[PDB]
Design an enzyme around this catalytic site. Structure first.
Site, PDB file in Angstrom:
ATOM      1  N   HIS A  41      10.896 -13.600  -4.275  1.00 21.69           N
ATOM      2  CA  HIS A  41       9.795 -13.954  -4.904  1.00 21.69           C
ATOM      3  C   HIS A  41       9.209 -12.774  -5.931  1.00 21.69           C
ATOM      4  O   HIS A  41       8.291 -13.022  -6.861  1.00 21.69           O
ATOM      5  CB  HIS A  41       8.416 -14.488  -4.207  1.00 21.69           C
ATOM      6  CG  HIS A  41       7.958 -13.675  -3.061  1.00 21.69           C
ATOM      7  ND1 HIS A  41       7.001 -12.640  -3.774  1.00 21.69           N
ATOM      8  CD2 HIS A  41       7.694 -13.771  -1.849  1.00 21.69           C
ATOM      9  CE1 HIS A  41       6.377 -12.323  -2.413  1.00 21.69           C
ATOM     10  NE2 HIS A  41       6.826 -12.932  -1.309  1.00 21.69           N
ATOM     11  N   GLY A 143       0.685  -7.216  -1.003  1.00 23.84           N
ATOM     12  CA  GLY A 143       1.385  -6.045  -1.319  1.00 23.84           C
ATOM     13  C   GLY A 143       2.115  -5.558   0.199  1.00 23.84           C
ATOM     14  O   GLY A 143       3.099  -4.561  -0.031  1.00 23.84           O
ATOM     15  N   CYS A 145       4.508  -7.537   1.355  1.00 25.78           N
ATOM     16  CA  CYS A 145       5.764  -8.380   1.420  1.00 25.78           C
ATOM     17  C   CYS A 145       7.132  -7.594   1.150  1.00 25.78           C
ATOM     18  O   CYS A 145       6.765  -6.410   0.373  1.00 25.78           O
ATOM     19  CB  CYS A 145       5.818  -9.316  -0.075  1.00 25.78           C
ATOM     20  SG  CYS A 145       4.421 -10.536  -0.012  1.00 25.78           S
TER      21      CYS A 145
END
Ligand SMILES: O=C1N(c2cncc3ccccc23)CC[C@]12CCOc1ccc(Cl)cc12
Ligand SMILES: O=C1N(c2cncc3ccccc23)CC[C@]12CCOc1ccc(Cl)cc12
Ligand SMILES: [Cl-]
Lengths: 305, 297
Positions: A41, A143, A145
């Site tokens: 993503h 942030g 991820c």
């Protein structure tokens, strides 16, 4: 003596954390050998999240659209490919700090350490368990991820989780390092919810054996139970069924303390019925389910108090 | 979202852990520059025991490499072994002495090899509720501020109640403890009030507000209640320190004190706060701010 929620030392993983940037999105990547692994993503914008077509978004990207930063050094991306929900960025430098490692897919009930990271920089380490509903009760802000979960039994790092999203109840969902999600989740901003969660019975039993090893027996009783009767009672408190596998796995702790698994199951049944009556077990007023039988054996002494 | 007992990343400390052996005793040492720091009880009247030792009696192992001891000296309850090699992995560091209520990360070690990391607090009775087995002596406690490691604790012993005692890195014990086998016990402990308040603010930040009420209290009335429930007194400095969390949530410190008083007098009534049925006191106001902001190292 003592019993703490203990994480593995994080140094071997800290030396693999990098920052991956694609356009306006910035998240964390795991640099092992000459490949950087990160959630796919990173190629999405907020609008794309409803129904992203990752193959269509990825085909429009070139190697130089991916900015990878390791410390104060910019790594050069020389290739890219998608594997399930993970993007693999081939870089021109092998990580000199790459530890001995494996990619392992874990089952619900298994525990692991999480190295929470922001901008490719580690901020903290904590211990957690893959819940029966395949979510994790982590501590992650936007942030985080690409932050990873791991175990380090001996000197080999077994990477088991990569963080992808937060669900509406505040719980977290992610993938193994091959990009396969744990549970029925998708890396889409579609209405998704964690299923009803349950207590990890085999872990609560392991933690009750840890309490006996450390010298506490107040919760034991003179009763035993059949596995079937225990499961009929357990299901009424939203506890996971206990299988013959779990009984076999608890064998060593049973032999060390001299308490049969079905006798410990009878103490658990009684604790569920009575509560703790102002008492604690290993400093907790709730029944703890985030220590596996293996974690108890690794942390506790081999000599029962 | 989420709230976990989080430790600092341990990598900068892992690269300093060594194994120290003297005769039959094996424990952990901290290798910084050309000195290995370890509990002086590795030798066993410590000056009399030490004078009988030579440099070659101390075996220091860093990974698979044997370090050569070229000097030794004692500073309080810590032994400093001068070695012939500076640690190439020595991070930026300071030795700091912490106060009761402050938290830190512990890198538990056995045979100079780190096995786990956990977060804990220096209790008001100067003990730590750690997780340590025989062989963990010399394991260290630390905090990280920017790129600097502040070493604050070195493990020495376990007390009869299963709690732990140790020193700062200058060898001064935390608490009225001595490094020898004699009758010693942890004093009566108390709850770190400023930390419970910080954790209640963390619960509000994470969307848990059932315990909030319309009431307020004076600091004096709150302290009369807190002294009844074995809670540490709350000072004006604690109130000042909680200022930022009070402004973020819109709940005055004395307004949160009235919630805490009601929790102390009535309990949780079957409810939990951040997944706990007990009032948690091992998160400082700084820990709450840091975890709810994502500060990195
Ligand atoms: O859950 C998400 N993020 C977060 C991840 N972990 C913690 C968080 C905390 C607070 C805000 C966001 C957080 C970042 C990306 C996002 C948000 C958009 O919707 C989606 C949809 C799918 C996926 Cl895979 C990811 C996301
Ligand atoms: O408390 C001690 N040790 C422990 C340390 N942490 C955990 C433990 C768990 C279980 C058994 C022992 C443990 C190791 C050395 C000992 C015991 C001997 O007598 C002394 C006397 C003084 C001193 Cl400073 C330390 C010790
Ligand atoms: Cl597993």
């Amino acid at each position: 003596s003592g019993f703490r929620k203990m994480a593995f030392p994080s140094g071997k993983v800290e030396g693999c954390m990098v920052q991956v940037t694609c356009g306006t999105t910035t998240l964390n990547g795991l640099w092992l050998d000459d490949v950087v692994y990160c959630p796919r993503h990173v190629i999405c914008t907020s609008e794309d999240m409803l129904n992203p077509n990752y193959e269509d978004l990825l085909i429009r990207k070139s190697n130089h659209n991916f900015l990878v930063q390791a410390g104060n050094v910019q790594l050069r991306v020389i290739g890219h490919s998608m594997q399930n929900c993970v993007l693999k960025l081939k870089v021109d430098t092998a990580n000199p700090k790459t530890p001995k490692y494996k990619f392992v897919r874990i089952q619900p009930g298994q525990t692991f350490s999480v190295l929470a990271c922001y901008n490719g920089s580690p901020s903290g380490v904590y211990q957690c368990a893959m819940r029966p509903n395949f979510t994790i009760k982590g501590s992650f802000l936007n942030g985080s991820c690409g932050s990873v979960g791991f175990n380090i039994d001996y000197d080999c790092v077994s990477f088991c989780y990569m963080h992808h999203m937060e669900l509406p109840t505040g719980v977290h969902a992610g993938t193994d390092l091959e990009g396969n999600f744990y549970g029925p989740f998708v890396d889409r901003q579609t209405a998704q919810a964690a299923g009803t969660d349950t207590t990890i019975t085999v872990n609560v039993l392991a933690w009750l054996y840890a309490a006996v090893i450390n010298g506490d027996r107040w919760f034991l009783n003179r009763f035993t139970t059949t596995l079937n009767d225990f499961n009929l009672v357990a299901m009424k408190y939203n506890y996971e069924p206990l299988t013959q596998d779990h009984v076999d796995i608890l064998g060593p702790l049973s032999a060390q303390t001299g308490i049969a698994v079905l006798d410990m199951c009878a103490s658990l049944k009684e604790l569920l019925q009575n509560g703790m009556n102002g008492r604690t077990i290993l400093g907790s007023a709730l029944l703890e389910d985030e220590f596996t039988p293996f974690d108890v054996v690794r942390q506790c002494s081999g000599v029962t108090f």
